[PDB]
Structure formats: C-alpha cells, structure tokens
Amino acid sequence: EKSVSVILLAGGPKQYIPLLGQPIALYSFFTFSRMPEVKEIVVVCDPFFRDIFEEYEESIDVDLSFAIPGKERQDSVYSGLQEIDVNSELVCIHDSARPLVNTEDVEKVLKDGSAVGAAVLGVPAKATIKEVNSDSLVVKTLWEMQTPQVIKPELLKKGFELVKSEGLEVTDDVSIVEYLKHPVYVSQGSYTNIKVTTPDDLLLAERIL
Amino acid sequence: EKSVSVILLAGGPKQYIPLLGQPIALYSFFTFSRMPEVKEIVVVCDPFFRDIFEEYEESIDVDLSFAIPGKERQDSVYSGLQEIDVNSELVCIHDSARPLVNTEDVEKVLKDGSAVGAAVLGVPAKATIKEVNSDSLVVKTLWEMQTPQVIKPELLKKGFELVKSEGLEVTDDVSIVEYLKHPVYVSQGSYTNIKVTTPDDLLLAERIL
Numbered sequence: 001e002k003s004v005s006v007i008l009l010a011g012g013p014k015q016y017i018p019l020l021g022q023p024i025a026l027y028s029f030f031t032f033s034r035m036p037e038v039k040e041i042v043v044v045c046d047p048f049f050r051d052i053f054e055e056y057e058e059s060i061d062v063d064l065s066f067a068i069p070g071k072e073r074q075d076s077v078y079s080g081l082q083e084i085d086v087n088s089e090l091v092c093i094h095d096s097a098r099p100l101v102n103t104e105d106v107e108k109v110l111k112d113g114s115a116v117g118a119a120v121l122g123v124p125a126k127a128t129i130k131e132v133n134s135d136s137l138v139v140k141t142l143w144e145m146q147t148p149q150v151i152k153p154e155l156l157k158k159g160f161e162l163v164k165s166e167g168l169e170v171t172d173d174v175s176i177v178e179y180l181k182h183p184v185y186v187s188q189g190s191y192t193n194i195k196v197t198t199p200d201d202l203l204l205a206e207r208i209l
Numbered sequence: 210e211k212s213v214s215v216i217l218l219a220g221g222p223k224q225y226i227p228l229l230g231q232p233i234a235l236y237s238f239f240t241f242s243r244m245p246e247v248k249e250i251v252v253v254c255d256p257f258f259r260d261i262f263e264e265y266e267e268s269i270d271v272d273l274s275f276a277i278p279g280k281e282r283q284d285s286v287y288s289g290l291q292e293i294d295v296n297s298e299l300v301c302i303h304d305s306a307r308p309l310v311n312t313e314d315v316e317k318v319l320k321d322g323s324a325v326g327a328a329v330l331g332v333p334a335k336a337t338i339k340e341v342n343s344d345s346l347v348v349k350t351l352w353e354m355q356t357p358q359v360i361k362p363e364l365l366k367k368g369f370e371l372v373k374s375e376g377l378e379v380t381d382d383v384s385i386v387e388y389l390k391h392p393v394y395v396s397q398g399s400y401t402n403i404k405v406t407t408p409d410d411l412l413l414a415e416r417i418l
C-alpha cells in the first residue's frame with residue numbers, strides 16, 4: 001500500500017476531449033486514484049490544464065503533484081520523476097490518452113513490475129507483421145505495447161544516467177529500458193486498452209464503457 | 210495488359226455486409242475489373258453468394274471464374290489457383306474484406322510483383338511492437354501486411370508443391386512464401402487499406418469513401 005508513484009502523461013488537445021462528459025485524461029486518473037497501492041499521482045501537463053485535475057484533489061485518496069512537460073516523451077517522464085516520493089518503490093508511467101485501462105490489468109503490471117523490476121502491459125499483435133530490410137525485402141512472437149509501463153525508480157534513474165553520460169539516442173522503439181541489461185516483463189493486457197485520439201477511436205470508447 | 214489473374218477471397222458474412230448500398234466484396238471486385246492489366250477474376254466464395262458477382266459479368270471488362278473455398282486460407286488460394294488462365298504471368302491474391310484498396314496501390318504491387326516475382330502491399334507498423342520470448346520477457350523496421358499479395362504462378366505452384374511433399378506447417382505468419390528462398394518485396398501502401406469487419410471499421414470506410 002502507498003508504494004507506487006504514478007506519472008500521468010497529459011502534456012501532449014486529444015487527451016482533454018470529453019468521453020461521456022468527462023475529459024479523457026480523468027478516466028485513468030480516477031482508476032489510479034482508487035488503488036490502495038498508489039501513493040501519489042504526478043500529473044505532467046501544461047500549467048493551463050492543471051485545474052482539470054486540481055478540482056478533485058480533496059476527494060481522491062492519493063497525493064497530487066504536478067510537473068512540466070518536456071520536448072519529447074522521455075523528457076516529460078524525467079520531469080515527472082523529479083517529483084515522485086523519495087520512498088516509492090515503483091514508478092507507474094501512463095499515457096493519459098489511454099482511458100479504458102482496467103484496474104485488474106494495472107494490478108497485474110504493478111505486480112510484475114515489483115517482481116521483475118520493469119513491466120509493461122501488452123497484447124499479442126493481431127496484424128501480420130514482417131521485418132523488412134533496407135531493400136524493401138521481407139526478412140524471413142510479437143506484442144503491441146500499451147501503458148502503464150512500470151519500473152523501479154533506481155532502475156529508471158540509472159537508465160537516464162546511462163543515456164545522458166553516453167549521449168545515446170532515445171526513440172519510442174529504442175527507449176531507456178532497451179539500453180539496460182535488466183529484464184522487462186510483458187504483462188498480458190486487454191485489447192480494450194486502446195489509445196483514444198481519432199473520432200473513430202472515441203466512438204469505440206463509448207461502446208466499451 | 211490482360212496478364213494478371215486475380216484470386217478474390219470471399220468465402221470466409223462480414224464481406225457481404227453493405228457499404229453505401231454495395232456489399233463490401235464488390236468494391237475491390239470493381240477496382241480490379243477496371244484495370245487493363247487484369248485478364249480475369251477468380252472469385253473464391255460459397256456457391257450461395259455467386260449471384261452477387263454474377264450480375265455484373267456482362268458489364269465488367271474481365272473474365273469471371275469461380276472456385277470453392279477450402280478449410281483454411283491457403284486451401285482457398287490453391288482452389289482459386291486451379292482456375293487461373295494457363296498463360297497469366299501474375300497471380301493477385303486479395304482479401305475481399307479489404308474494399309478501399311486504391312487503383313494506384315494495386316498498380317504499384319503488380320509492378321513490384323512482376324519485377325521481383327513476389328510482392329505484398331504493406332505499411333509501417335504504427336504501434337510499438339516488441340519481440341517477446343517464452344518467459345514473457347522483451348527480446349532486446351516492422352511492417353503491417355495488407356493485400357493484394359502478388360506472386361508469379363510458377364513460384365506459387367512450387368511453393369504449394371514444397372509444402373505438400375515435405376508436410377510443412379502453414380500459418381498466416383509462416384505462409385507459403387516464407388519457406389521459399391525467393392525474395393518478397395514490400396510495396397508501400399496506404400493506411401486507408403483497412404480490413405473492414407467490425408462496426409467500428411465500417412463507419413471508418415464511409416469516411417474514407
């Protein structure tokens with residue numbers, strides 16, 4: 001209990017457009033807020049949208065903190081990290097554009113994160129996927145990554161230190177953890193944990209809700 | 210001109226539910242029918258749904274043929290193959306659940322198929338995809354395959370012969386071509402070439418049309 005710090009990424013506005021009268025960002029916010037394991041939520045957002053979350057500070061059973069977004073995703077994660085409790089045992093990074101994440105699946109990835117040191121929710125890739133070389137020729141089990149991405153703070157800090165001191169290039173595919181020798185566990189999630197951005201995605205969310 | 214035999218897979222009913230008053234299967238049917246390169250379309254469908262395509266036989270500028278569906282996808286392809294013109298230089302296999310395929314992209318994959326011997330329409334995978342081992346740990350450029358999948362008939366026949374004589378297992382991922390040493394080219398397609406099956410997918414198709 002109270003061992004997990006959530007970093008909620010909401011500074012990328014697609015994540016504020018409403019879902020049944022509630023801005024998309026608030027759905028996972030509340031999901032995390034109700035979990036006894038969660039000590040605090042560090043919201044990473046433009047100071048302008050701070051009010052959206054601030055209104056509920058008294059009603060929620062977690063600590064609320066704020067951090068400023070960075071240039072790209074890893075910078076926003078670093079910003080959030082600077083704000084987490086000194087004693088938290090787990091960092092739970094979540095894309096707020098993912099509103100329908102189930103409590104049971106968050107529980108699963110937290111458990112796997114605590115056990116392994118790093119865990120991410122994923123589902124088997126439904127599409128037929130092939131590796132293709134530079135000559136556009138096919139190179140003769142694949143999983144789609146979701147969020148939360150759960151990592152012990154010491155490991156995350158070491159990962160940032162490794163990238164900075166060596167000047168390593170970070171992309172969405174080649175993230176901080178890809179450079180570490182520490183294992184990353186894939187917790188099996190639900191296909192309903194979609195990223196809601198396009199109008200096509202938003203009508204699906206209502207059906208799931 | 211008149212060098213390509215299309216195998217239209219329509220015996221898998223999701224592919225007959227209407228799109229703006231026209232059954233989904235008829236969209237690519239007509240797209241192929243208008244291309245001068247296409248000699249014939251072999252429709253692979255339950256004899257029950259033969260009428261859907263038969264009504265237009267006189268108005269279309271291609272030969273129409275019919276074949277019986279098999280147990281799985283490769284069996285249906287084999288069935289269609291038995292019906293193609295003895296002199297066609299290219300087989301163009303298409304999933305009829307893909308209605309919005311553009312003429313320009315079909316032209317592209319036919320060209321690449323003629324050049325290389327085998328080509329498939331694909332798009333870069335938008336999702337973050339990782340390889341995961343048997344212990345559910347991340348294994349530290351990926352493309353999503355679409356259709357048409359274009360192959361020279363001799364190569365396709367050899368591929369079927371290789372699988373039968375050796376008793377090789379065929380899956381959607383490990384298809385006939387995966388066993389051949391002959392190169393497969395990935396022609397860059399459009400994200401609009403979606404597989405239309407779910408109600409969520411059908412409303413998207415109208416927007417694209």
Ligand SMILES: Oc1c(Br)cc(Br)cc1-c1[nH]c(Br)c(Br)c1Br
Nearest residue numbers: 074077118119120149150175176
């Ligand atoms: O890409 C991953 C994965 Br596959 C698993 C975990 Br656990 C964390 C990250 C990650 N993503 C960002 Br952005 C940062 Br920083 C980190 Br660490």
Ligand SMILES: Oc1c(Br)cc(Br)cc1-c1[nH]c(Br)c(Br)c1Br
Nearest residue numbers: 283286327328329358359384385
């Ligand atoms: O899976 C592919 C690919 Br990636 C490229 C081409 Br060209 C053809 C196939 C294929 N699919 C089936 Br079903 C059969 Br039979 C064959 Br051959």
Ligand SMILES: [K+]
Nearest residue numbers: 033035036061
């Ligand atoms: K709590």
Ligand SMILES: [K+]
Nearest residue numbers: 098099100194
């Ligand atoms: K979601």
Ligand SMILES: [K+]
Nearest residue numbers: 024028096099
């Ligand atoms: K959310």
Ligand SMILES: [K+]
Nearest residue numbers: 101102105193
């Ligand atoms: K979920």
Ligand SMILES: [K+]
Nearest residue numbers: 111112115116
């Ligand atoms: K364990």
Ligand SMILES: [K+]
Nearest residue numbers: 195197198201
């Ligand atoms: K999407």
Ligand SMILES: [K+]
Nearest residue numbers: 242244245270
């Ligand atoms: K024609």
Ligand SMILES: [K+]
Nearest residue numbers: 307308309403
């Ligand atoms: K399509």
Ligand SMILES: [K+]
Nearest residue numbers: 233237305308
């Ligand atoms: K079609």
Ligand SMILES: [K+]
Nearest residue numbers: 310311314402
């Ligand atoms: K297309």
Ligand SMILES: [K+]
Nearest residue numbers: 320321324325
């Ligand atoms: K060429």
Ligand SMILES: [K+]
Nearest residue numbers: 404406407410
């Ligand atoms: K789909």
